Design an enzyme around this catalytic site. Structure first.
Site, PDB file in Angstrom:
ATOM      1  N   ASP A  64       3.057   5.103  -3.825  1.00  0.00           N
ATOM      2  CA  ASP A  64       2.726   6.096  -4.833  1.00  0.00           C
ATOM      3  C   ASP A  64       2.926   7.558  -4.399  1.00  0.00           C
ATOM      4  O   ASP A  64       3.628   8.321  -5.071  1.00  0.00           O
ATOM      5  CB  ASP A  64       1.313   5.881  -5.344  1.00  0.00           C
ATOM      6  CG  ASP A  64       0.250   5.794  -4.241  1.00  0.00           C
ATOM      7  OD1 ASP A  64       0.496   6.052  -3.026  1.00  0.00           O
ATOM      8  OD2 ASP A  64      -0.878   5.462  -4.633  1.00  0.00           O
ATOM      9  N   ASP A  88       0.834  -1.184   0.000  1.00  0.00           N
ATOM     10  CA  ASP A  88       0.000   0.000   0.000  1.00  0.00           C
ATOM     11  C   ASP A  88       0.880   1.248   0.000  1.00  0.00           C
ATOM     12  O   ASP A  88       1.993   1.211   0.486  1.00  0.00           O
ATOM     13  CB  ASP A  88      -0.882  -0.026   1.258  1.00  0.00           C
ATOM     14  CG  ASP A  88      -1.896   1.061   1.282  1.00  0.00           C
ATOM     15  OD1 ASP A  88      -2.325   1.512   0.187  1.00  0.00           O
ATOM     16  OD2 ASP A  88      -2.280   1.462   2.414  1.00  0.00           O
ATOM     17  N   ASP A 107      -8.720   3.693  -2.964  1.00  0.00           N
ATOM     18  CA  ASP A 107      -9.780   4.060  -1.990  1.00  0.00           C
ATOM     19  C   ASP A 107     -11.089   4.566  -2.606  1.00  0.00           C
ATOM     20  O   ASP A 107     -11.453   5.733  -2.484  1.00  0.00           O
ATOM     21  CB  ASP A 107      -9.195   5.077  -0.990  1.00  0.00           C
ATOM     22  CG  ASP A 107      -8.011   4.483  -0.200  1.00  0.00           C
ATOM     23  OD1 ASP A 107      -7.826   3.252  -0.287  1.00  0.00           O
ATOM     24  OD2 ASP A 107      -7.265   5.225   0.474  1.00  0.00           O
TER      25      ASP A 107
END
Ligand SMILES: [Ca+2]
Ligand SMILES: [Ca+2]
Ligand SMILES: [Ca+2]
Ligand SMILES: [Mg+2]
Ligand SMILES: [Mg+2]
Ligand SMILES: [Mg+2]
Ligand SMILES: [Mg+2]
Ligand SMILES: [Mg+2]
Ligand SMILES: [Mg+2]
Ligand SMILES: [Mg+2]
Ligand code: NI
Ligand code: NI
Ligand SMILES: [Tb+3]
Ligand SMILES: [Tb+3]
Ligand SMILES: [Tb+3]
Ligand SMILES: [Tb+3]
Ligand SMILES: [Tb+3]
Lengths: 1247, 458
Positions: B398, B395, B457
């Protein structure tokens, strides 16, 4: 933008074709083509034939193709490459590729206007072809379709579900893939299909390519995708369970996991995996917490048990990973992860530490507007109140800012929130305990519920935009304060030192400078407080000795002003007016007060203008109408002007504060806290004006609302300067509170009377203030202070009747010195119980006693002493050494160690002696400290009676950088061996000058000496102008081509009593082009100033690091420098300098050697010198850490540095110099993680 | 919007005058003037004689003044009110107030265009007069001066250190205070001085008024401010210790607090008070944890002993409060606090519950581009793998988005983080266990290291 040139060479070789292209130069461009498959072409364009840069990780490093057997025909124009599936044509002049199917159907081509070039590729194709690739869409974006027919979006990985890359292809039968780290693909409906490297993309670029490396695919979409995967790589097969259903969950333990697997399996709902969020790991903890199983959530993950049990129920486990580490534990200590990462270089480049969260909570705003809601809120607060919360810091009563939650509170929420605590606490304690609150908004009416206002989450910087633009800083605060006062909320404070920084809480604390100046500022505002961000520290001792001492000092002023201040707290209950106000309140008709905020009034009788500028040498202070007296320096200034006000940028001791004509300022002894003891004498300093002025002294319990029903004490004090006398009227006591004040000591400045009456009785005279304070019953005395003549009058406070006091006559004191009884001074040490003491248990002392217990390391006494100008003051210390032998004590002035005193045996503890030491004092307040500095080799163990401070110096000094500069003259640190914080240059244009304000006690001839540098090679000239009189010529010889050399020019000048102006100016006949540093002034011959003993350049490392110094450094070849200079304010807690703002450091995370060195020619050869330094070392004990003296003609001398974590002083005495030079240095040999701090290095002539 | 019309009625009575004004209907307008002090006038405009609305909490409800003995002359045009300090003229046709000093000096007036009306007040004055009040500035704004000579900023409490209100005054000799829940003051250098209720402001409006209740002050700044405090309230006296130095802190327990206090006392650096952030309370916990001492951080606040020991060393304690409660404990259970507030209706109107964070950590991104970095990252993951983590949910490879921290990871960050786990697990298991991973970004090449892509998300 230009395209390729003509083909001049074509070398076929199997499936490869290398084409040389004319660019006009001897280094031709190269274009290599490689047929990788029947449907896949590689192209490499290499400008000027340069070697190609390494391919990015886009490309599969192990890619592999069988031989194709392509057909390359270089025999004509175009050149022609063929396979069964494609046909590549390159026209020779200029070079232009056309790509076709093997049937000759054209697919795409490089247009005439240009194809491949240094920064990309440009094709043209059918205008109606559909294009795919380039990009996808993230979880925060408008989500488009598949088509990319009009696209300028960058090619990037992106965030939050995005995807992208330099890959553009079409259903019309072709694709293009460029090897690039980011970049700018471009399509439009005229048929362009281009890609450009461009400039550094938002995401960074870490693979640069001098060449252009692309691939052209030919086929239907499947073949294009398969070709894409031959080049960038195929996907390894995932475990078969990966095709199963997976339940991801945040907020989960082993019990809930097992219940979830049961629920699935009971219902024959298939599932192969659970993925666990943060719950799975000890995120936040030391020793690699972010890699380790959380066995509180998952007990059986202590072994393989959980794994194997879940295996047997058919569940695989997936765990969340973030690509980062925790660099702090809960206790704010560095983690092992941090140390391993920092030391081996594993952090993402350009990413510093930052603040995250990870345990959310769910909340909802309460409504303070309902009475029943208020009662509830209060009822639940009572227990916290009984247990110690007696002030309510009501935060965030204004607006919510939490992701999607953007809710405003109404305008009365701060009033109502305050009402809840006010009405409640009052009813609960029967009006017995006063309410204190603070909030971060204000709207009218809120003040009825006892609340202050603070200026919110402000920035740790000097002004808006200094370090970042998104919060204001220190310089803006006065404006916020006074704006609040203009709204009727003058009970205002701020987070002194600032709250926010870049990085959030892990971001830097204030510089020592910023901290110091902010404390001086905040001490003259109403609600005085520091407040940092999470885990930050705002204690003054953490920011180095200057910050500590200057803050302490200004703190003592504030607490001495307690009774002045408190009358204004009472005023706010009558009229709403408080402790501060802008000048326009007093001066409604004056345009220069209309928007004035750099200064304001503290109570009625003090105008304050804090030094808020970084590296500020002087202030321009507007003084409105009247006559103002400098609070600290003594001089008068007439009102209605902007004054030039010199400040010492080296000490940070100045707080410009001016007394308003008519001033009446009750003050008291300094207390550690407001009700520490009862105060029975209150002083009243009185500065009479021609019109009556008054101040009403006020006392009450400081605790309860009894004041509301008459339970308070007040006494009107008033004064006037008459023709030949001063009149002071002490009104009768009023109200039922029995005050603690028993006597006032009036200090009536400007007159030293020969008589003092009261109800037509002359009062008994005493020989001085000391004897007056010893007497019971009324009296007077006279004396001298920094302001000039003063008459002391001691009366009873709280009589039932008025008393008029009249001071007449003029009989000035002949006193040459101020006397400070040290038992009345500030006493300190290492712990609360190990401080210096007061005693009366040996005879022969002056005053009410003397100071003892200077016999445990770090005990000390500190006197605050006003001087009218900077210069040399011989200060007399009265002491008793009944020990048997000579004792030692350090004398620090303004946080610098001036000398180790050797204090001889005086026979016994009741026999007293005097040592007199020449101290470097600055104009205004000085901080003189007598201390047992065990860490500096002192013994301690004497008793101290008092010090005596001449009113006038033996010789005066004036910093040039603090003088009034004009006509281009400026300040600078870009040459060496200047004194103080800087020097003056740019005396170059006619008009350029520096103008000193020089004070003389009496009209006469005075000696001057002007320190200057002339590096021009020849003599140069300025003019001197004394009191705007006739120019005299100042002829300034050059010692040679060196601007790091400073001479004295000596001359005389005729001065008047008081303020004189002496300018040094380039008038048109003068040549200019010299640097000025300091003007020295004396009735005697001028000698070496106490402030200028130091022979080193930048020995305190205070110079701005942009500018170099006489220090050099060394480290072993190929090792990074371990050496830097900064403030230590980025660290948490701060690791400040020994003095002022900066200190050198040696540090590396790994094994290292390092040294710094400085060579100085000494003024006097065949004589004795001394090296002193502050040193602090911490963490790993090095093999070697020492100061080094050598080159002096004798053999190297050393002093080792001990690994203590504290500031020590290191002294190398008796350096016998016979070489003409000294080399001083510091050297460290460490296995790694040795941090050394070096500071306040002085090389002096040793008595 | 129209000015008042003609005076048709004028009832003097003691220190009060009551003007009836024609609006062309059978329900005439009322203007009540009240001389509260020699230098303070209260004007209440009631459209169509409607009863007045309740005053907002701006107004001190217990406020009262001695009688003044003003002179009210209704004999001619204009009507005239007089104190020793001010002269008020109301011209009859149309009704327009002029405020003067006792000596005749004109201070401000209601222009022929119109003054008071149903939605606020409009005055005109010397164009060169300096105006003050209205607003201040917050910890996120460009910070101006004290002058308010060209101001359109609204009157509000604001946030982050801001302050404001419907209060506009001048050093030229006058003030204007309007009772209002928010609203829109206006000034300009032609000499306008105006206040409008306008629409519902950003911060909402819980007190709406049908009438317009305002106050005119006459005097020097200190007199104006005293009059402001008569109307809106004086300040209660605060404990004396509140003039002392206060250290506020977040990240503090009983031992650190004691060590601080000893530090100030050892040095004779005065200080009266410590203020404590979240550390002092059980924020987050059930049974009113946001009201209750955190005895893990402060053991001696089990009883009064902490209060009393600090009191003996000259230290008061201040504690942080937030106007909210926790509606779910760490477990996700509804709190007692929640039930009591929901069932009595104690939540702020229009504010729903929301997720906030409060325990900070400090972190720093790692670099997966470096082989040695990857080796290290894998090495420290082996234990988690042996013990059951066989899929790598990677996760946030980025972008960081945390306060001022807005760092990007580079385009190969996903590929390289994936590589770390791929090379590592393949080596450590002798190619025996297939790698599975997922990440929320993709760039060409990343597929080589066994990673999927998920859409973030959503
Ligand atoms: Ca003494
Ligand atoms: Ca200098
Ligand atoms: Ca230094
Ligand atoms: Mg091949
Ligand atoms: Mg290039
Ligand atoms: Mg089971
Ligand atoms: Mg654990
Ligand atoms: Mg009345
Ligand atoms: Mg309306
Ligand atoms: Mg608890
Ligand atoms: Ni994108
Ligand atoms: Ni605002
Ligand atoms: Tb769950
Ligand atoms: Tb490091
Ligand atoms: Tb008063
Ligand atoms: Tb009088
Ligand atoms: Tb702390």
């Amino acid at each position: 933008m230009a395209g390729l040139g003509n083909v001049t060479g074509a070398v076929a070789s199997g499936d490869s074709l290398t084409l040389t292209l004319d660019n006009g130069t001897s280094a031709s461009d190269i274009l290599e083509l490689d047929v990788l498959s029947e449907e896949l072409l590689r192209v490499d364009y290499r400008p000027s034939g340069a070697a190609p840069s390494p391919s990015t990780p886009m490309i599969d490093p192990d890619a592999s193709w069988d031989a194709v057997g392509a057909t390359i025909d270089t025999s004509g124009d175009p050149i022609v490459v063929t396979t069964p599936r494609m046909r590549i044509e390159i026209a020779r002049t200029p070079a232009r590729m056309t790509i076709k199917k093997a049937d000759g159907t054209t697919l795409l081509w490089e247009p005439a206007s240009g194809g491949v070039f240094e920064d990309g590729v440009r094709f043209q194709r059918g205008s109606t072809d559909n294009i795919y690739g380039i990009r996808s869409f993230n979880a925060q974006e408008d989500v488009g379709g598949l088509l990319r027919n009009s696209s300028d979006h960058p090619a990037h990985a992106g965030q939050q579900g995005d995807a992208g890359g330099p890959f553009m292809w079409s259903t019309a039968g072709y694709g293009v893939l460029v090897d690039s780290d980011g970049g700018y693909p471009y399509t439009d409906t005229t048929g362009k299909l281009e890609f450009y490297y461009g400039g550094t993309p938002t995401e960074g670029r870490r693979y640069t390519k001098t060449n252009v490396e692309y691939y052209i695919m030919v086929g239907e979409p499947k073949e294009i995708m398969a070709s894409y995967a031959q080049v960038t790589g195929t996907a390894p097969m995932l475990p078969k369970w990966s095709l199963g259903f997976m339940n991801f969950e945040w907020g989960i333990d082993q019990d809930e996991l097992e219940a979830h697997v049961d629920g699935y399996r009971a219902r024959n709902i298939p599932i192969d995996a659970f993925a666990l969020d943060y719950d799975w790991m000890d995120y936040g903890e030391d020793n690699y917490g972010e890699f380790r199983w959380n066995t509180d959530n998952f007990p059986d993950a202590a072994t393989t048990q959980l794994k194997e049990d879940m295996e047997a129920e058919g569940i695989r486990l997936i765990g969340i990973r973030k690509p980062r580490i925790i660099t702090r534990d809960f206790a704010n200590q560095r983690t092992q992860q941090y140390y391993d990462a920092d030391s081996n270089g594993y952090f993402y480049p350009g990413h510093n530490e930052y603040t995250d969260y990870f345990i959310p909570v769910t909340v909802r705003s309460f409504d303070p507007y309902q009475q029943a809601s208020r009662d509830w809120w209060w009822q639940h607060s009572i227990d916290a109140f009984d247990k110690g919360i007696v002030g309510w810091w009501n935060d965030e009563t204004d607006k919510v800012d939490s992701g999607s939650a953007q809710y405003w509170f109404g305008n009365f929420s701060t009033g109502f929130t305050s009402q809840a605590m006010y009405d409640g606490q009052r009813d609960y304690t029967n009006d017995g305990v006063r309410v204190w609150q603070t909030a971060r908004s204000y709207y009218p009416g809120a003040q009825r519920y006892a609340t202050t206002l603070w200026s919110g989450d402000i920035g740790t910087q000097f002004y808006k935009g200094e370090l970042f633009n998104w919060a204001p800083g220190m310089q803006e605060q006065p404006r916020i304060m006074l704006s609040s006062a203009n709204l009727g909320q003058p009970k205002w404070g701020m987070d002194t030192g600032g709250f926010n920084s870049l990085g959030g809480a892990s971001g830097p604390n204030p510089s020592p400078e910023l901290y110091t100046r902010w404390m001086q500022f905040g001490a003259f505002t109403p609600v005085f407080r520091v407040h940092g961000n999470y885990n930050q520290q705002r204690q003054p001792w953490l920011y180095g000795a200057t910050a500590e001492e200057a803050s302490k000092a200004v703190m003592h002023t504030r607490y001495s002003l307690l009774p002045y201040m408190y009358a204004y707290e009472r005023e706010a209950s009558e009229t709403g007016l408080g402790l501060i106000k802008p000048l326009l309140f007093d001066y409604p008709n004056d345009p220069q007060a209309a928007d004035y905020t750099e200064a304001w009034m503290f109570g009625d009788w003090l105008l304050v203008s804090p030094v808020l500028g970084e590296a500020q040498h002087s202030k321009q202070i507007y003084l409105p109408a009247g006559t103002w007296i400098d609070y600290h320096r003594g001089q008068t200034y007439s009102g209605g002007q902007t004054i030039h006000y010199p400040v010492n940028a080296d000490t940070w001791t100045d707080v410009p504060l001016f007394v308003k004509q008519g001033a009446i300022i009750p003050n008291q002894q300094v207390l550690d806290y407001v009700d520490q003891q009862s105060v029975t004498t209150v002083n009243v300093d009185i500065f009479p004006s021609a019109s009556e002025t008054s101040f009403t002294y006020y006392e009450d319990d400081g605790s309860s609302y009894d004041y509301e029903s008459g339970s308070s004490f007040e006494q009107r004090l008033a004064a006037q300067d008459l023709s030949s006398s001063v009149r002071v009227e002490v009104g009768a006591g009023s109200g039922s509170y029995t005050p603690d004040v028993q006597h006032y000591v009036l200090k009536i400045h400007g007159r030293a009377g020969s008589a003092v009456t009261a109800g037509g009785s002359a009062l008994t005279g005493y020989g001085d203030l000391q004897a007056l304070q010893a007497a019971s019953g009324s009296g007077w005395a006279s004396g001298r202070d920094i302001y000039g003549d003063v008459t002391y009058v001691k009366l009873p406070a709280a009589s039932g009747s008025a008393t008029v006091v009249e001071v007449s006559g003029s009989a000035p004191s002949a006193a040459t010195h101020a006397i400070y009884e040290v038992e009345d001074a500030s006493r300190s040490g290492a712990t609360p119980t190990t401080r210096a003491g007061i005693n009366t248990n040996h005879s022969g002392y002056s005053g009410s006693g003397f100071v003892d217990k200077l016999d445990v390391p770090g005990a000390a006494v500190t006197v605050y002493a006003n001087a009218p100008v900077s210069g040399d003051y011989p200060v007399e210390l009265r002491y008793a050494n009944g020990s048997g032998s000579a004792k030692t004590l350090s004398v620090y002035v303004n946080a610098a160690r001036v000398q180790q005193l050797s204090l001889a045996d005086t026979g016994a503890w009741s026999q007293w002696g005097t040592q007199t030491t020449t101290l470097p004092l600055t104009a205004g307040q000085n901080i003189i400290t007598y201390k047992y500095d065990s860490d500096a080799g002192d013994t301690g163990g004497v008793n101290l009676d008092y010090i005596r401070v001449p009113f006038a110096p033996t010789q005066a000094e004036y910093a040039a950088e603090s003088a009034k500069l004009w006509g281009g003259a400026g300040t600078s640190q870009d040459h060496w061996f200047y004194k103080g914080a800087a020097f003056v240059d740019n005396l170059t244009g006619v008009g350029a000058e520096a103008s000193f304000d020089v004070y003389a006690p009496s009209a006469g001839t005075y000696n001057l000496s002007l320190r200057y540098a002339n590096g021009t090679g020849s003599t140069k000239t300025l003019s001197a102008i004394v009191n705007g009189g006739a120019a005299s010529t100042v002829t300034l010889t050059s010692p040679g081509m060196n601007w790091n050399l400073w001479n004295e020019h000596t001359m005389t000048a005729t001065l008047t009593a008081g303020r004189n102006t002496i300018s040094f100016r380039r008038n048109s006949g003068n040549s200019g082009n010299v640097n000025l540093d300091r003007l020295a002034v004396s009735a005697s011959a001028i000698t070496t100033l106490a402030s200028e003993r130091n022979l080193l350049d930048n020995g305190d490392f205070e110079r701005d690091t942009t500018y170099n110094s006489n220090w050099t450094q060394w480290q072993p070849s190929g090792q990074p420098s371990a050496f830097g200079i900064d403030s230590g304010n980025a660290l948490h807690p701060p690791e400040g300098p020994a003095r002022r703002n900066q200190r050198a450091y040696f540090h590396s995370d790994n094994a290292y050697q390092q040294s710094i060195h400085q060579v100085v020619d000494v003024p006097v050869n065949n004589a004795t010198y001394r090296l002193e330094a502050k040193v602090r070392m911490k963490n790993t004990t090095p093999t070697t850490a020492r100061a080094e003296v050598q080159g002096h003609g004798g053999s190297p001398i050393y002093a080792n540095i001990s690994n203590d974590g504290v500031w020590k002083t290191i002294v190398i005495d008796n350096i016998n110099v016979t070489s003409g030079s000294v080399d001083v240095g510091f050297y460290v040999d460490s296995p790694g993680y040795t941090t050394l701090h070096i500071d306040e290095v002085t090389l002096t002539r040793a008595p």
